[PDB]
């Protein structure tokens, strides 16, 4: 007898004994239960007080080596209760079995605590079912910070916000430790995260199996557990997610991709080296970053990462953030048909096929699209299947597969005598496509950040050459640094304006960064090649290829703003 | 019997009755007592939890019209116990007497609460002496946010930090109100602040008088109470101090100083209008802003305010933030002899005398300073007495009063034929001065922010003239806007770098803003005067007067940074 009543008397014997001991037949508790773990119904100070209170009640209930046995039992239960193939689960179990290390609550979450009706203090704790290590429960509580950005959150809640009032993981860890007495640093933390994620995956699989007599969430959980199983999680105190991702990006870059620059350049005059690097980056978790949902970071962190990966010429290819593909990916994901999404994006997010965005025709109503394209970047790749054309309120963009009859590449276009193997013309002669086959802010931001990174590398090279081999060169260096700093500041300001105050109130800054950057970057490239009297050739080629209506647009917007202000 | 024991049994009868009723002879309480109200011994979440807990214990002890009589009694007690002349106290009492509107604790502060030894929860509340309105106690608790930036904090603590973890005043107000049930908005809040400040001043005066049988703190408290007695304090929820100061600056500007522009310009070809405006600004509290201790704001708020007050040509004169005076004031305040400070700064902070910083000689050891100055700005003012000269590690700056024998102005220097009534040469022929009479970051930041504001006003004027009367003018407008945005971003970045990561790690950005701004601002002025084919004459004069070694310095620093990075 433990069901609801209008609680009950309530291995129920173990739970009853635990309740009796704690008191040294529980009735109803008149308190709240935050289903969503983001706590959106209170202020910031209230959220911080709530999390401090749960930390201290955990400490008070804890402070007042069969862990491997528990891991083995959970592995056996998950393997016996499994109903679908899951190599990730077996890999995670094998990896955790290679790692070794009281009265816990088993499933201590924010959803199993009833507070006071008018005050933020813990009144009672329930659901003490799987109770039998003084640090595993803390890891189970704190794992929700690393809930995968792709998997929807459990208990119908939003992902944990940052800079809102919630304590960061290190902050909560320090609170609990100082409440207990142990040192802030903790050992075998990767093992704790792996065990917690594996236990959660097993619980979800068991719940799904019981409901059959949650199902698709075991694979993302196992993948994330494997991803965090090989890292250095600093328990002691030290967006934060953006900084961690940027640090990992820099480490991966400096450890793998810079030494391959010479080999790639020699092969230029896609190699299997790029394929191996792509596989390594996908395995390490650094893949499809630029997608604003598969990675979860904010716009400013995106711009900083793009700046960090614009230095190498072919760097965006490794992270699957090429120039044409990302716009089509964003268009498909944001406002796209579910059937069209399943048909097309699945061949993009896995890197199966490329894409192309072309507007440099007739889209008259099925519908027929007869016209001639031009300057279509990335149209010559052997793995280029999809194609998005926004041709003639005549703006109607419709997908057109390149394998459809009537599509035929005409000739390759050369810029300054470089074929750009890493601009073939396209002709569409009355292609028949079904009706099923039928913004710029992030694109401009990333296209400016990459150019800024390129200019920074150019300045580094020019400074090194000037030192290795007068006042004029020093003046050139100083002017280049000034221009680089100003352009970076403008780009970051535009990105932050897009992030905070919507996306429709940042057209002015986008036009401004579209105007400012290329001129100064071309000037810097010219000064560098003049000082030289080498990778700089590729940088100059890119800067010249990437090189006055936007000034008129900015003037119109400025005049409108001045008229509005008065 | 209420003294300490190793508490006691403990109008003590009223306190004993209150304790007995609350329980329905208190012993010692084993808990902490935060003397400093900033709570520096805990983390951010712990601070937020502490303040939430004090808010809810206040609400629980309160929720579970003799206010004018109490005000009159406090006024009588303060007047009878007064020992020194205080017109501010009488003025505040008269102002409060014109404003009209349970079981309180009288002196409910963070210093009269004992928490738990290991948890952040309220255990007991003490010092219930003056207990007899359900909102006055809240105002007394929350007044500590407006502790004057000049008066040192009480109970030997630091001023309340921002963006640290402490709740903002509106946030705490909302917490307490939602705990009680009243609406977030509150009436007669200015009266509450005035009464709270007057009561605190009376308590301090009484404590000082009792100790004589705190003394100098009654005047700043009364002045601050008078200053906040005339404002609009929004109780409901809506740096914050920087934003409030900037809003007040903009309101004062647009309400008083812009209409006087025509009169001042006509008088040009200091008037009593400037004196009246200076008196009004000093009365309103907007005075000596640029001093980094008499105002208390951070560097970024300082730059934003300076940008807002750089638009009017003579605006810095009203706020007492002139170009030469502020450097000498900062040098005196930061590292200056107490005797020298009392001798000189007191004639500056009150606007009694001006100053001048001149280095464009011999300071050989008393000491004699014989040499010829040049381009000494502000040396012709009739109220110019002090003078700081850093002349010949020969850098030894020594104050030299201008009334001393041997100092005589030579001739006035004209720039472009403007005498600049709002540059006389100085000659020092063996001045005898005692040995008693013996950085650039804020100066450069403000000197760039004012120029940015001037450029913004110039662009506004040029846009208005272009509308009132082609593609080239539109292109000019767009380029001017781009340059203005880039320069503002650079200036703010340099100011923030000075603020956060010390003042010795921002020389590069300071040199960068010293290089970048004048060229673009001069170009904008040239384009404006070309479009015109008027206040713009004064703006061009200033921009030209304010107009290549810094490039070499920046190149040297950049080369050193590149060498260090490798
Ligand atoms: C490296 C590279 C990659 C490219 N990739 C792509 C791609 O992926 N997809 C794609 O669709 N296109 C692509 N393009 C083409 C790109 O769209 C063109 O550079 C651009 O659209 C101009 O094409 P256009 O010949 O129509 O310009 P035109 O209209 O022929 O050029 C007119 C020029 O005159 C000037 N001008 C315009 N209006 C005014 C005015 N009112 N007053 C004064 N001057 C004015 C401007 O300088 C303007 O560029 C690429 C080009 C390059 C060089
Ligand atoms: C409006 C105004 C207000 C002023 N107010 C003050 C004031 O309050 N206090 C004060 O002390 N002074 C003041 N001055 C003077 C100011 O210090 C001077 O403008 C400046 O110091 C230059 O003086 P100078 O004659 O010694 O320069 P000079 O040394 O005679 O000029 C040399 C010039 O050559 C160039 N140059 C220098 N080194 C190099 C190099 N290595 N390579 C190439 N070119 C180089 C630079 O353009 C430099 O300005 C003011 C000036 C003006 C115009």
UniProtKB/TrEMBL annotation, chains A, B:
<keyword id="KW-0274">FAD</keyword>
<dbReference type="InterPro" id="IPR041726">
    <property type="entry name" value="ACAD10_11_N"/>
</dbReference>
<dbReference type="Pfam" id="PF00441">
    <property type="entry name" value="Acyl-CoA_dh_1"/>
</dbReference>
<dbReference type="InterPro" id="IPR013786">
    <property type="entry name" value="AcylCoA_DH/ox_N"/>
</dbReference>
<feature type="domain" description="Aminoglycoside phosphotransferase">
    <location>
        <begin position="1"/>
        <end position="152"/>
    </location>
</feature>
<dbReference type="InterPro" id="IPR036250">
    <property type="entry name" value="AcylCo_DH-like_C"/>
</dbReference>
<keyword id="KW-0576">Peroxisome</keyword>
<feature type="domain" description="Acyl-CoA dehydrogenase/oxidase N-terminal">
    <location>
        <begin position="245"/>
        <end position="352"/>
    </location>
</feature>
<dbReference type="GO" id="GO:0017099">
    <property type="term" value="F:very-long-chain fatty acyl-CoA dehydrogenase activity"/>
</dbReference>
<dbReference type="GO" id="GO:0005777">
    <property type="term" value="C:peroxisome"/>
</dbReference>
<dbReference type="GO" id="GO:0070991">
    <property type="term" value="F:medium-chain fatty acyl-CoA dehydrogenase activity"/>
</dbReference>
<dbReference type="Pfam" id="PF02770">
    <property type="entry name" value="Acyl-CoA_dh_M"/>
</dbReference>
<dbReference type="GO" id="GO:0005634">
    <property type="term" value="C:nucleus"/>
</dbReference>
<dbReference type="GO" id="GO:0050660">
    <property type="term" value="F:flavin adenine dinucleotide binding"/>
</dbReference>
<keyword id="KW-0007">Acetylation</keyword>
<comment type="similarity">
    <text>Belongs to the acyl-CoA dehydrogenase family.</text>
</comment>
<dbReference type="InterPro" id="IPR011009">
    <property type="entry name" value="Kinase-like_dom_sf"/>
</dbReference>
<keyword id="KW-0443">Lipid metabolism</keyword>
<keyword id="KW-0560">Oxidoreductase</keyword>
<dbReference type="InterPro" id="IPR050741">
    <property type="entry name" value="Acyl-CoA_dehydrogenase"/>
</dbReference>
<dbReference type="InterPro" id="IPR046373">
    <property type="entry name" value="Acyl-CoA_Oxase/DH_mid-dom_sf"/>
</dbReference>
<keyword id="KW-0285">Flavoprotein</keyword>
<dbReference type="InterPro" id="IPR002575">
    <property type="entry name" value="Aminoglycoside_PTrfase"/>
</dbReference>
<dbReference type="InterPro" id="IPR037069">
    <property type="entry name" value="AcylCoA_DH/ox_N_sf"/>
</dbReference>
<dbReference type="Pfam" id="PF01636">
    <property type="entry name" value="APH"/>
</dbReference>
<dbReference type="GO" id="GO:0031966">
    <property type="term" value="C:mitochondrial membrane"/>
</dbReference>
<comment type="subunit">
    <text>Homodimer.</text>
</comment>
<comment type="pathway">
    <text>Lipid metabolism; fatty acid beta-oxidation.</text>
</comment>
<feature type="domain" description="Acyl-CoA dehydrogenase/oxidase C-terminal">
    <location>
        <begin position="439"/>
        <end position="556"/>
    </location>
</feature>
<comment type="function">
    <text>Acyl-CoA dehydrogenase, that exhibits maximal activity towards saturated C22-CoA. Probably participates in beta-oxydation and energy production but could also play a role in the metabolism of specific fatty acids to control fatty acids composition of cellular lipids in brain.</text>
</comment>
<dbReference type="InterPro" id="IPR009075">
    <property type="entry name" value="AcylCo_DH/oxidase_C"/>
</dbReference>
<feature type="domain" description="Acyl-CoA oxidase/dehydrogenase middle">
    <location>
        <begin position="357"/>
        <end position="422"/>
    </location>
</feature>
<keyword id="KW-0276">Fatty acid metabolism</keyword>
<keyword id="KW-0472">Membrane</keyword>
<protein>
    <recommendedName>
        <fullName>Acyl-CoA dehydrogenase family member 11</fullName>
    </recommendedName>
</protein>
<dbReference type="GO" id="GO:0004466">
    <property type="term" value="F:long-chain fatty acyl-CoA dehydrogenase activity"/>
</dbReference>
<dbReference type="GO" id="GO:0033539">
    <property type="term" value="P:fatty acid beta-oxidation using acyl-CoA dehydrogenase"/>
</dbReference>
<dbReference type="InterPro" id="IPR009100">
    <property type="entry name" value="AcylCoA_DH/oxidase_NM_dom_sf"/>
</dbReference>
<dbReference type="InterPro" id="IPR006091">
    <property type="entry name" value="Acyl-CoA_Oxase/DH_mid-dom"/>
</dbReference>
<dbReference type="Pfam" id="PF02771">
    <property type="entry name" value="Acyl-CoA_dh_N"/>
</dbReference>
């Amino acid at each position: 007898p433990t069901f609801f009543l209008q609680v009950l008397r309530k291995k129920i014997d173990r739970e009853f004994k635990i309740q009796k001991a704690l008191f040294s037949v529980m009735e109803h508790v008149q308190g709240r239960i935050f289903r969503d773990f983001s706590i959106p119904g209170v202020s910031s100070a209230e959220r911080a007080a709530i999390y401090v209170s749960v930390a201290e009640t955990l400490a008070w209930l804890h402070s007042l080596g069969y862990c491997k046995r528990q891991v083995s039992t959970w592995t056996k239960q998950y393997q016996a209760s499994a109903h679908q193939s899951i190599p990730a689960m077996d890999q995670l179990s094998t990896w955790l079995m290679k790692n070794l290390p009281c009265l816990v609550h088993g499933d201590f979450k924010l959803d199993n605590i009833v507070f006071h009706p008018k005050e933020c203090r813990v009144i009672a704790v329930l659901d003490w079912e799987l109770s039998t290590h003084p640090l595993t429960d803390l890891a189970h509580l704190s794992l929700f910070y690393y809930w995968p950005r792709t998997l929807p959150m459990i208990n119908r809640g939003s992902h944990i916000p940052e800079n809102t009032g919630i304590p960061l993981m290190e902050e909560l860890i320090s609170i609990y430790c100082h409440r207990r007495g142990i040192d802030p640093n903790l050992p075998n933390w990767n093992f704790f995260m792996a065990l917690s994620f594996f236990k959660l995956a097993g619980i979800s699989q068991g719940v799904y199996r019981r409901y059959l007599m949650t199902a698709n969430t075991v694979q993302p959980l196992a993948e994330t557990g494997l991803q965090l199983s090989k890292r250095t999680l600093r328990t002691t105190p030290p967006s934060r997610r953006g900084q961690e991702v940027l640090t990992r990006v820099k480490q991966f870059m400096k450890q793998h991709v810079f030494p391959a620059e010479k080999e790639v350049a020699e092969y230029y005059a896609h190699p299997l080296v790029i394929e191996k690097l792509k596989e390594i980056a996908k395995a390490e978790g650094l893949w499809n970053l630029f997608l604003p949902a598969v990675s979860g970071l904010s716009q400013v962190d995106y711009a900083l990462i793009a700046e960090e990966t614009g230095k190498c010429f072919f760097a965006p290819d490794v992270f699957n953030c090429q120039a044409p593909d990302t716009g089509n990916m964003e268009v498909l994901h944001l406002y796209g048909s579910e059937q069209q999404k399943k048909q097309w994006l699945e061949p993009l997010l896995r890197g199966d096929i490329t894409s192309v965005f072309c507007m440099t025709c007739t889209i008259q109503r099925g519908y027929i699209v007869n016209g001639k394209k031009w300057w279509s970047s990335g149209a010559g790749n052997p793995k280029c299947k999809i194609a998005i054309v926004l041709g003639r309120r005549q703006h109607s963009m419709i997908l057109v597969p390149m394998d459809t009859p009537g599509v035929e590449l005409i000739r390759p276009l050369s810029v300054f005598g470089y074929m750009d193997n890493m601009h073939w013309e396209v002709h569409f002669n009355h292609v028949r496509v079904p009706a099923s086959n039928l913004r710029l802010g992030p694109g401009r931001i990333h296209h400016c950040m990459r150019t800024v990174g390129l200019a920074e590398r150019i300045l580094q090279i020019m400074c090194d050459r000037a030192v290795q081999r007068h006042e004029v060169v020093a003046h050139w260096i100083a002017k280049s640094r000034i221009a680089i700093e100003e352009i970076r500041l403008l780009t970051l300001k535009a990105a932050h304006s897009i992030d905070t105050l919507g996306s429709a109130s940042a057209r002015k800054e986008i036009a401004m960064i579209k105007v400012a950057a290329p001129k100064a970057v071309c000037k810097i490239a010219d000064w560098a090649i003049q000082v030289h009297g080498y990778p700089l050739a590729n940088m100059y080629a890119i800067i010249r290829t990437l090189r006055e209506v936007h000034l008129s647009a900015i003037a119109k917007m400025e005049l409108q703003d001045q008229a509005r202000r008065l």
